[PDB]
Amino acid sequence: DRPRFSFSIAAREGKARTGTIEMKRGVIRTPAFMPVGTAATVKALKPETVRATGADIILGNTYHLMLRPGAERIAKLGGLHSFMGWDRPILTDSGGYQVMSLSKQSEEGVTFKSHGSRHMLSPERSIEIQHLLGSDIVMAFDECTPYPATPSRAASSMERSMRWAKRSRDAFDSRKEQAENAALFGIQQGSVFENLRQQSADALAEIGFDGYAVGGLAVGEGQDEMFRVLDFSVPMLPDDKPHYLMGVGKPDDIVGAVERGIDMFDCVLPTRSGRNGQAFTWDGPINIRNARFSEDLKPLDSECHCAVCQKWSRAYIHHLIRAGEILGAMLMTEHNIAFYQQLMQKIRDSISEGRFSQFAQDFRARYFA
Amino acid sequence: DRPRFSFSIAAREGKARTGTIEMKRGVIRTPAFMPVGTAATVKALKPETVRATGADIILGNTYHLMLRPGAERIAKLGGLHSFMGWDRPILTDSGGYQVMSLSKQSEEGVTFKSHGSRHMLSPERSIEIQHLLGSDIVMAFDECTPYPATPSRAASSMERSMRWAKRSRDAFDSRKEQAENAALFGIQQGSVFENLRQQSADALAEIGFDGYAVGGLAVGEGQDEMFRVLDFSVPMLPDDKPHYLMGVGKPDDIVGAVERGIDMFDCVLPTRSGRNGQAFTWDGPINIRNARFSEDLKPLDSECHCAVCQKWSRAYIHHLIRAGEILGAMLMTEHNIAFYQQLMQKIRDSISEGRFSQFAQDFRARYFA
Ligand SMILES: [Cl-]
Ligand SMILES: [Cl-]
Ligand SMILES: [Zn+2]
Ligand SMILES: [Zn+2]
Structure with a gap:
């Protein structure tokens, strides 16, 4: 079929x-x-x-x-x-x-x-x-x-x-x-x-x-x-x-x-760099090991729809990655792959709607801000 | 309440x-x-x-x-x-x-x-x-x-x-x-x-x-x-x-x-030894890294109800653990913890039913066979 x-x-x-x-x-x-x-x-x-x-x-x-x-x-x-x-x-x-x-x-x-x-x-x-x-x-x-x-x-x-x-x-x-x-x-x-x-x-x-x-x-x-x-x-x-x-x-x-x-x-970037502590966000990448996240109760990204951002804080994932815990690699990887897929969905929707040029400009202005 | x-x-x-x-x-x-x-x-x-x-x-x-x-x-x-x-x-x-x-x-x-x-x-x-x-x-x-x-x-x-x-x-x-x-x-x-x-x-x-x-x-x-x-x-x-x-x-x-x-x-035994390649079965523990499992399509345990045994073979988990893959640790750990919980459920049911003595004898005879 x-x-x-x-x-x-x-x-x-x-x-x-x-x-x-x-x-x-x-x-x-x-x-x-x-x-x-x-x-x-x-x-x-x-x-x-x-x-x-x-x-x-x-x-x-x-x-x-x-x-x-x-x-x-x-x-x-x-x-x-x-x-x-x-x-x-x-x-x-x-x-x-x-x-x-x-x-x-x-x-x-x-x-x-x-x-x-x-x-x-x-x-x-x-x-x-x-x-x-x-x-x-x-x-x-x-x-x-x-x-x-x-x-x-x-x-x-x-x-x-x-x-x-x-x-x-x-x-x-x-x-x-x-x-x-x-x-x-x-x-x-x-x-x-x-x-x-x-x-x-x-x-x-x-x-x-x-x-x-x-x-x-x-x-x-x-x-x-x-x-x-x-x-x-x-x-x-x-x-x-x-x-x-x-x-x-x-x-x-x-x-x-x-x-x-x-x-x-x-x-391999979303998976490999996820295990290494790099999380992708709409405001650019962050390294979750940085001490600035040790008490940050926000999710990895404020808009992300993934299951990791619905449930766990930056502070928890910071702790996991600094402790070398497998769950840290699991959660970082799921978020990063989900972020990549959400990027592809936003690309697909914006081309379908004839506003991809604007999306690309808006994406870059925020991501590199 | x-x-x-x-x-x-x-x-x-x-x-x-x-x-x-x-x-x-x-x-x-x-x-x-x-x-x-x-x-x-x-x-x-x-x-x-x-x-x-x-x-x-x-x-x-x-x-x-x-x-x-x-x-x-x-x-x-x-x-x-x-x-x-x-x-x-x-x-x-x-x-x-x-x-x-x-x-x-x-x-x-x-x-x-x-x-x-x-x-x-x-x-x-x-x-x-x-x-x-x-x-x-x-x-x-x-x-x-x-x-x-x-x-x-x-x-x-x-x-x-x-x-x-x-x-x-x-x-x-x-x-x-x-x-x-x-x-x-x-x-x-x-x-x-x-x-x-x-x-x-x-x-x-x-x-x-x-x-x-x-x-x-x-x-x-x-x-x-x-x-x-x-x-x-x-x-x-x-x-x-x-x-x-x-x-x-x-x-x-x-x-x-x-x-x-x-x-x-x-x-810590089910978690720690799971990461190390030891899987618990009703016929005793096995080390999934052993070469005898490299082409074994059976689940880790033939009766286990866990999600790992419903989906993946010994051969796959053997490959993951020998390759040092995180998913190997995840699947071994989930199976071992599920096996422990199924053991506790069988213990609880057999005591409730007044046949725990027989369960213990049957368990030991098979587990150490
Ligand atoms: Cl990778
Ligand atoms: Cl452990
Ligand atoms: Zn997320
Ligand atoms: Zn199982």
């Missing part, structure tokens, strides 16, 4: 869009934020809590899960959805970034040492691992180069990534169960160079994908440069397909990226 | 009793197990989850809370119940054991260094701290001696504890809000010596308390010796008041202690 993958744009304002991706396991409202669930858990949250915050889809990692607990093992246990208890869509990263980030490169693929066993990844093996996991949105396997990259290392990694994108496409299409029930996204590369981004976009559009990610950003280029690259890169992608900015980001990063045509986001 | 403290025994079988303690913040079904909430949290659980497992009352610690976040601070923030979000009864230990365990003794009290500021505790100060916390069941402040104690160190600590019990009684009665809304328990001491236990029981009964704890056990004496001391010590206490065995214990410890007349228990 439900479709494999149907993206519908309900409203536009400038370059920003809002709409839905319908998939067999559920609907994804866009612009969407995906909580990161690296090792088959969104850290410190039950899946029901992740859903309660408003998340429609989570992200899992091919590289981590292939090492622990193992992709064939997860398949034997019934797939990633059943294993971790999340029955809605899951997007899996292909492994390319973490192989470079955490762990021998050739045209066939890459061999590497686990962060210390030896493992192989290729476009075909990445697609097969994501099939074994049961991913709903499969990412093409690419080759990343560190930042800052020379123009030579940018062009060579990009063209190989495009050759690997065609191999990923073919491996995915060769697996009937995958091609009938999942979607495949290609990844635009080319670093900060407009002509390479164009060559990458053209190659991916020639192959044909369900969605297009902007890769190679959120690697330490600063917000000004990221926005500058998004300015020319997103219009190169097919307008009628979703645009996914990998690894981004801070709340203001997300707002500016939506203003430039991005529909999907993932980032 | 609700009474300050009303203990009713609904059924008996041998020395075992089952019934209720009615208090202003709720009813406590006995025999009762109290999850330990040391630093104003039952580790890795929201209070709603603690309640969902069946807990009627939790335990907090005078010694830890007076150091962090501070008793006057908690009172300024509205009391411990409001601070941590648990609106049901709270029993607070008086500080005597942790002062000895974790941190200069005289007849007036004890001075000590925090585990490194300097602090004072006396019967009057302990009662006042528990008043500031808003405890529902206040423990008399006593002087503990390490195990194994000589007969001289046992008698001297006990008689001082009895002098301190009268001072605790007087300080409690002097505080109208405390005396009208909370209860006060005295602590029997005397180590493994029958005559000292009798002198202690007589002194406490002369003073008069709402309930009577058996102190000085669960300090490394083994189950045989603990049971031997309970055999003669519990009958010395007033029959018409609750009997509280502090710091106990393993499931078989609890069953045997109920067989000897104990009504209330607290222990």
Whole structure:
């Protein structure tokens, strides 16, 4: 009854869009934020809590899960959805970034040492691992180069990534169960160079994908440069397909990226920085460990609708985090993920109502005040 | 409308009793197990989850809370119940054991260094701290001696504890809000010596308390010796008041202690050992980290009614705990506390039905098989 993958744009304002991706396991409202669930858990949250915050889809990692607990093992246990208890869509990263980030490169693929066993990844093996996991949105396997990259290392990694994108496409299409029930996204590369981004976009559009990610950003280029690259890169992608900015980001990063045509986001910031004591508020981030919160009976944020802000004070959460208590990480993480989802809802509503430009201005004025 | 403290025994079988303690913040079904909430949290659980497992009352610690976040601070923030979000009864230990365990003794009290500021505790100060916390069941402040104690160190600590019990009684009665809304328990001491236990029981009964704890056990004496001391010590206490065995214990410890007349228990074992990978089952404890569980799709326990066993496999929880994931600690802890509460429910039902002797035999035969 439900479709494999149907993206519908309900409203536009400038370059920003809002709409839905319908998939067999559920609907994804866009612009969407995906909580990161690296090792088959969104850290410190039950899946029901992740859903309660408003998340429609989570992200899992091919590289981590292939090492622990193992992709064939997860398949034997019934797939990633059943294993971790999340029955809605899951997007899996292909492994390319973490192989470079955490762990021998050739045209066939890459061999590497686990962060210390030896493992192989290729476009075909990445697609097969994501099939074994049961991913709903499969990412093409690419080759990343560190930042800052020379123009030579940018062009060579990009063209190989495009050759690997065609191999990923073919491996995915060769697996009937995958091609009938999942979607495949290609990844635009080319670093900060407009002509390479164009060559990458053209190659991916020639192959044909369900969605297009902007890769190679959120690697330490600063917000000004990221926005500058998004300015020319997103219009190169097919307008009628979703645009996914990998690894981004801070709340203001997300707002500016939506203003430039991005529909999907993932980032560890709300979870990781929550465990570290950083809470997001409409008046900017706060560090709850600061002594100024020790007797503050207000919730983390005065407008937030999350269950944490309905029940517990800053003072209590300050105590938990300073004491190293697990409940501190749980409450900070639930609030931060809920805050991110409320940001996405405000973005979606304001685009639908044709007042997203004003929302972005009002958001920034208060958030950086 | 609700009474300050009303203990009713609904059924008996041998020395075992089952019934209720009615208090202003709720009813406590006995025999009762109290999850330990040391630093104003039952580790890795929201209070709603603690309640969902069946807990009627939790335990907090005078010694830890007076150091962090501070008793006057908690009172300024509205009391411990409001601070941590648990609106049901709270029993607070008086500080005597942790002062000895974790941190200069005289007849007036004890001075000590925090585990490194300097602090004072006396019967009057302990009662006042528990008043500031808003405890529902206040423990008399006593002087503990390490195990194994000589007969001289046992008698001297006990008689001082009895002098301190009268001072605790007087300080409690002097505080109208405390005396009208909370209860006060005295602590029997005397180590493994029958005559000292009798002198202690007589002194406490002369003073008069709402309930009577058996102190000085669960300090490394083994189950045989603990049971031997309970055999003669519990009958010395007033029959018409609750009997509280502090710091106990393993499931078989609890069953045997109920067989000897104990009504209330607290222990860190289900929480602490849950975080460490030990799950309690009706077939005995298992360590979920063991490789034998890596592909085991069964729940932690085949009969357990808890939400963890309804949803997740041993294999998943094995992965979480081996990966150091917070959700592993959350799920193990919820299951273990739920298992303890189901044990207490089975104990209560079997005493009510006059088949507790058979339950204890059936429990032990299966648990140690
Ligand atoms: Cl994270
Ligand atoms: Cl604990
Ligand atoms: Zn909130
Ligand atoms: Zn269970």
